[PDB]
Design a binder for this molecule. Structure first.
Ligand code: 4EV
Length: 208
């Protein structure tokens, strides 16, 4: 059973802007997704301080970067708080409508697409490099779900029966044909070192 949802008009507009605007500095997508994973890991860390049982679903707090050249996917995995079905539908736990407005207002005042994260809608920078994004998530208070969107105004949500992950979020980027440099080990290393060198969690770049 797959449920299909319309993106709110502002998010559809934001995604269209990310996909259609000429902007060469696409590598910032990885900084934005690692930043989101870091935020999710801080959240479960903070909740665990008063309720250590919240780590029964996994004590390790980390971020894994998984390139797959055969599938042309770059997956960002974290063992953060995860998202409920409600969080997923509500723009992946973001204030995407007000955030999109503030980002638009910022762009008019001299900002560029790299500042997207400041407005809490950094997730959508995934569409700088991906034609489709799949989000597999598991929060302690809910079931495992898969969110997916190829943009075009809609997203789907379904239960995810395969590969139980325990807790956290997996962001699967189905890369555009001309964005395969983000599958290269030296390119991923370079971006992590440039933009995410002081993240407070281990970032493991998997090899093939
Ligand atoms: O699961 C989250 C998340 C992030 C911040 C707060 C929260 O309640 C959930 C998440 C959201 C986006 C992403 O790219 C990675 C993630 O782990």
């Amino acid at each position: 059973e797959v449920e299909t949802f319309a993106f709110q008009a502002e998010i559809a507009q934001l995604m269209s802007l990310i996909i259609n605007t000429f902007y060469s500095n696409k590598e910032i997508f990885l900084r934005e997704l690692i930043s989101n994973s870091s935020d999710a890991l801080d959240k479960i860390r903070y909740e665990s301080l008063t309720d250590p049982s919240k780590l029964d679903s996994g004590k390790e707090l980390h971020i894994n970067l998984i390139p797959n050249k055969q599938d042309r996917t770059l997956t960002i995995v974290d063992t953060g708080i995860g998202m409920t079905k409600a969080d997923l539908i509500n723009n992946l736990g973001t204030i995407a409508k007000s955030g999109t407005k503030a980002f638009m207002e910022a762009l008019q005042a001299g900002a560029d697409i790299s500042m997207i994260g400041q407005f809490g809608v950094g997730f959508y920078s995934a569409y700088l490099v991906a034609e489709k994004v799949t989000v597999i998530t598991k929060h302690n208070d809910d079931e495992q779900y898969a969110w997916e969107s190829s943009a075009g105004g809609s997203f789907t949500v379904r239960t995810d029966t395969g590969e139980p992950m325990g807790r956290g979020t997996k962001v699967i980027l189905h890369l555009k044909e001309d964005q395969t440099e983000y599958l290269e080990e030296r390119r991923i290393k370079e971006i992590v070192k440039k933009h995410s060198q002081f993240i407070g969690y281990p970032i493991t770049l998997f090899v093939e």
